[PDB]
Structure 1
Amino acid sequence: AGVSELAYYPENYIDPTIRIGQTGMMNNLLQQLSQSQLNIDTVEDSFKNYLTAFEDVANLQVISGYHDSINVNEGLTYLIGYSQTEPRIYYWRNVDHQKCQHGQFAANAWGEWKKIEIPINVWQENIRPVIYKSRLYLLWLEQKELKNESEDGKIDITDYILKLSHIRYDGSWSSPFNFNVTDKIENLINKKASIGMYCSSDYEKDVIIVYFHEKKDNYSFNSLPAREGMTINPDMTLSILTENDLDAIVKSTLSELDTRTEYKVNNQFATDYLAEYKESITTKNKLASFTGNIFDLSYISPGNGHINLTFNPSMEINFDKNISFLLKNGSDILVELNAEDHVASKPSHESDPMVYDFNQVKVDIEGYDIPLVSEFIIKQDIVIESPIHIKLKSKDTSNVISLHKMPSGTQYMQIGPYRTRLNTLFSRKLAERANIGIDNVLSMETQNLPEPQLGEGFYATFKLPPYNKEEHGDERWFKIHIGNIDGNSARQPYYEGMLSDIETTVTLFVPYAKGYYIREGVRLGVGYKKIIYDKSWESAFFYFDETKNQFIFINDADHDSGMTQQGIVKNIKKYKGFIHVVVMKNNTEPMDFNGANAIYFWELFYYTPM
């Protein structure tokens, strides 16, 4: 009854003092305020001491990230931010991509910023996180410049050192592990080049990969950047890595490299594929444990989407027209094997474990997600299921997290078309509120303070027709798609909402970065259960006029001889599927209590007064 009442009435079980997931500054206010005697001066000093820590966490700023998966939209990203001090203090937080159901994160996805205890002095913001064996390692460069500035005995010593530290289970950080790397960085400095830094974790090999490269404007797969590299084992010894492995290991991840103008986030390393499988799988029957297994799995990708597996299946029964091996696709039995046929060294009954060792299994499969099922049929009814999930790493730029900082101070993460705010500029407004009085920070006007728009961009309100089972279909939804973003000019699932009664609208932010809008500019059409729109100007076409420095909606009338970003096209039809599509002209989006920093604003405006 307590659990069911806590479900239906959470108001009965909330206290303002303790909470699952409250921050350290919240606990520090609770410590500072836990007395018998609470004056107004004591509580105002406690609140100002709280606002100092809130300001310190509000002025964080992301340098780099690491995505823990092959696919961007599946794993969870580890970001590193710093504070505005000269002894620059670094922080790490976590954000989950399973929680974002369609392009936009919930505030449940974001983790709290956590101060790292280790003092770190990065050279030129070359600090990268990496997840290795589900553990957060942290890599950064330091230099030691010692210059004489003389003629008699001029001495110029630079020492470039790579440091590695990882987190423990008690929140502590390891003492940093030093790597003298000044030879490789001086080989890249003697060439006229700015130095980037790749850090990721290979999972097939049990190592982590650190190579340093020159920063070009683009990486073209024929002209590889100047590069000297290194890899380092779970025991913190250093492993040499030859130039052939280095060439293959740079060609596998050119798309994730920090260029001169755009900062990337490294993914988990995979050359072509990674296979998710377990070797030994048991059943433990009342008669005998059968324990069928797959021993030596190796795979080679010969082209774009193909794969060549190689493994040695066997079953290890310890106490014919009987037992068989059979590997399935979704429905395709790809390799079927028998024990009586094509098996060398059939075991004798004097063995208690009977190992069969069928043959070497080669098979040619195409696709990117390959959910294979290896089965050890025993019947006459015992099936030993051994799944092998083989996932491809898409080398597209849509599989790369990019992070950007605007000159307004705002800072966002961009996956494809979607942009997610990482920073807050509330602290730049907070001092004017706070030096006036404590009443003025907890105002609603402080909560209604505008923020920048996350990049160049624009807004557009889309008004939608009612649902009446015709011109819509059955299932009562709309998918506002998008086109003309990358060289991919196709229907991308930008926004999805449930269609409603008589009138429903939605205002969408549409990005822009001067490299997008391939032909005619971004189109924004409606999807339905019935026939979807976007057939030759049915969609909502925009572009950016560089002369007027604004965004222009093309369609509105039945315009003839109208301006497009290419040139003047002849006959321009009206958008179909909507009713009203209009650029919103400096929308606000005030402070986003469901955002990245949402827990801090909730603690400031609700939990601290409570």
Structure 2
Amino acid sequence: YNQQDTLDSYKNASMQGLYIFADMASKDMTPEQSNVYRDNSYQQFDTNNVRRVNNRYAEDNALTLHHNENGAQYMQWQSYRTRLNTLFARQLVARATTGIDTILSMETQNIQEPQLGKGFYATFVIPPYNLSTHGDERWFKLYIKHVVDNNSHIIYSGQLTDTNINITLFIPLDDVPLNQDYHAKVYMTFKKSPSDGTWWGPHFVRDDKGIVTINPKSILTHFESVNVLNNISSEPMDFSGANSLYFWELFYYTPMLVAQRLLH
């Protein structure tokens, strides 16, 4: 297909294609026959600026790959973004210039990952568990809303401690907001009060410059504190993400394997 800036243009694109069979013979596709496959799955076609992910043919946006300007690659689907590459090894060279004792050090494991997409880092403080406020089941869930679509999504799930819990989350923000008064909504649910209230959690809004603030109309009672880390555009290296295996591969397994070999 010819590259076009909008999905609206693929609706009438002169789709070329062909068929490949199990014996790896092929046949050309008839224009009518190509246009069927076009009209069913024109949304999966890549744009000039946005790269999409293909799917098995069928007869709610597609998965997408963004190459951010800061160097983070991430996969997006609806409100969810997940990192793909890691810039750890590109920052490590400075640590390697002073040798092994610095590679394995603690601050090395705190090299920052640049943030992915557009969003703000927010710190949420979970109030102490109490039976009267939260009920007998200690579960709680953080939900995000009014990002991409009105339907809410889960962003964190946990158990209420007697202590506070400090939870720092990257909150995605859309290219253009759905609502002018609040650009994102976050509410926390538990056993006692699983239902959401219209204003009953932190609402976030963003001005023309990159600063985010909490809407005073929203009610913070379900949180012991909410803070927006407007100065932060990065997060710690992730021992649970995609490269989690390689990071456990290096920081713990390799020293332990070496020590075990030196023991014998």
TM-score scaled by length of structure 2: 0.86
1:446 matched to which residue of 2? 108
> Cα deviation per residue 1:24-66 (whole Å; 9 max; x = unaligned)?
xxxxxxxxxxxxxxxxxxxxxxxxxxxxxxxxxxxxxxxxxxx
TM-score scaled by length of structure 1: 0.39
2:21 matched to which residue of 1? 233
8 A Cα contact 1:219 1:254, kept in partner = yes
1:251 matched to which residue of 2? 39
2:172 alignment partner, one of 497, 511, 514 = 511
1:263 matched to which residue of 2? 51
2:82 alignment partner, one of 416, 420, 438 = 420
CA–CA distance in 2 between the matches of 1:471 and 1:458?
29
SS at match of 2:101: helix
SS at match of 1:429: helix
> Cα deviation per residue 1:93-112 (whole Å; 9 max; x = unaligned)?
xxxxxxxxxxxxxxxxxxxx
Alignment-mate amino acid for residue 251 of structure 1: D
> Which structure's residues are more often strand, by fraction?
1
Cα drift, residue 436 of structure 1: 3.0
CA–CA distance in 2 between the matches of 1:222 and 1:450?
40
Alpha-carbon RMSD across the aligned residues, in angstroms, is 2.3
Q: What is the aligned length? A: 254
8 A Cα contact 1:526 1:533, kept in partner = no
Alignment-mate amino acid for residue 432 of structure 1: A
SS at match of 2:176: coil
2:235 matches 1:589:
yes
8 A Cα contact 1:533 1:539, kept in partner = no
> Which structure's residues are more often helix, by fraction?
2
8 A Cα contact 2:10 2:42, kept in partner = no
8 A Cα contact 2:143 2:187, kept in partner = yes
Cα drift, residue 525 of structure 1: 0.7
8 A Cα contact 1:229 1:246, kept in partner = yes
CA–CA distance in 2 between the matches of 1:430 and 1:480?
34
> Cα deviation per residue 1:485-522 (whole Å; 9 max; x = unaligned)?
22x31322232222222422311110124234445211
> Cα deviation per residue 1:262-291 (whole Å; 9 max; x = unaligned)?
1111112121xxxxxxxxxxxxxxxxxxxx
CA–CA distance in 1 between the matches of 2:175 and 2:70?
18
Cα drift, residue 218 of structure 1: 2.2
Cα drift, residue 598 of structure 1: 2.1
CA–CA distance in 2 between the matches of 1:461 and 1:605?
28
2:236 matches 1:575:
no
2:261 matched to which residue of 1? none
> Cα deviation per residue 1:410-436 (whole Å; 9 max; x = unaligned)?
211122222211111123223223233
2:222 matches 1:552:
no
1:605 matched to which residue of 2? 251
Cα 1:264–1:223 shift into 2, 3 Å? closer
8 A Cα contact 1:525 1:533, kept in partner = no
Cα 1:445–1:493 shift into 2, 3 Å? closer
**Unmatched segments (≥5 aa) in structure 2:** 259-264
2:91 alignment partner, one of 429, 432, 440 = 429
8 A Cα contact 2:202 2:218, kept in partner = no
> Cα deviation per residue 1:173-215 (whole Å; 9 max; x = unaligned)?
xxxxxxxxxxxxxxxxxxxxxxxxxxxxxxxxxxxxxxxx222
CA–CA distance in 1 between the matches of 2:14 and 2:147?
31
2:8 matches 1:220:
yes
Alignment-mate amino acid for residue 441 of structure 1: I
**Unmatched segments (≥5 aa) in structure 1:** 1-212, 272-395, 556-571
Which stretch of structure 1 is more off in the superposition, 409-418 or 512-521?
A: 512-521
Larger RCO (CA under 8 A, 6+ residues apart): 2
Cα 1:493–1:436 shift into 2, 3 Å? closer
Q: How does 1:325-340 map to 2 (within 5 A)?
A: none
2:204 matches 1:542:
yes
Alignment-mate amino acid for residue 593 of structure 1: F
CA–CA distance in 1 between the matches of 2:204 and 2:132?
28
2:183 alignment partner, one of 502, 521, 544 = 521
8 A Cα contact 2:239 2:247, kept in partner = yes
Cα drift, residue 222 of structure 1: 8.6
CA–CA distance in 1 between the matches of 2:97 and 2:198?
58
CA–CA distance in 1 between the matches of 2:107 and 2:138?
38
CA–CA distance in 2 between the matches of 1:413 and 1:422?
7
